[PDB]
Ligand binder design. Structure first.
Ligand SMILES: CSc1ccccc1CC(=O)N1C[C@@H](C(N)=O)C[C@H]2C[C@H]21
Ligand SMILES: [Zn+2]
Length: 139
């Protein structure tokens, strides 16, 4: 579980999105595991606009924040699931770190703000869905 709240937007994993998110849909992308829904209240999360490759992510399965080195956003194969068939997921960033299925949504942050959220994991790895290219979130 976990969301990003910037201005009149809510950013969640598309596989974890609720009925309200779909009733107030702004943009969704299956290949990125992202969904953006509109909000009534004003959100206050700063989105990072950078090329950072080091940051800190929240791990709800360990109740701890972890510093990580992460890859540049890319097309990375993800195995079949109960939400998506086997496919390349775009704008994904991998790091060495603990991830569990319910850790999806945990925020990855650098010194410049929110980078993205936990999307994939397993085998001593954690994958983050990047949100830095979505410039319309700020505007
Ligand atoms: C971080 S979740 C996790 C953790 C350890 C091991 C396995 C998983 C499962 C995983 O990688 N997922 C990928 C996600 C996707 N983007 O397609 C769909 C939901 C099922 C989540
Ligand atoms: Zn940064």
């Amino acid at each position: 579980s976990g969301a990003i709240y910037v201005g009149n937007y809510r950013v969640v994993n598309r596989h974890l999105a609720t009925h309200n998110d779909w009733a107030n849909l702004v943009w969704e992308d299956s290949s990125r595991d992202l969904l953006v829904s509109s909000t009534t209240a004003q959100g206050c999360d700063t989105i990072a606009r950078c090329d950072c490759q080091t940051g800190v992510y929240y791990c709800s399965s360990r109740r701890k924040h972890y510093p990580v080195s992460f890859s540049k956003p890319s097309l990375i194969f993800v195995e079949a699931s109960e939400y998506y068939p086997a496919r390349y997921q775009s704008h994904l960033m991998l790091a060495v770190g603990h991830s569990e299925p319910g850790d999806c949504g945990g925020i990855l942050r650098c010194q410049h703000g929110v980078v993205g959220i936990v999307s994939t994991g397993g085998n001593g790895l954690v994958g983050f869905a990047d949100v830095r290219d979505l410039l319309w979130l700020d505007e």
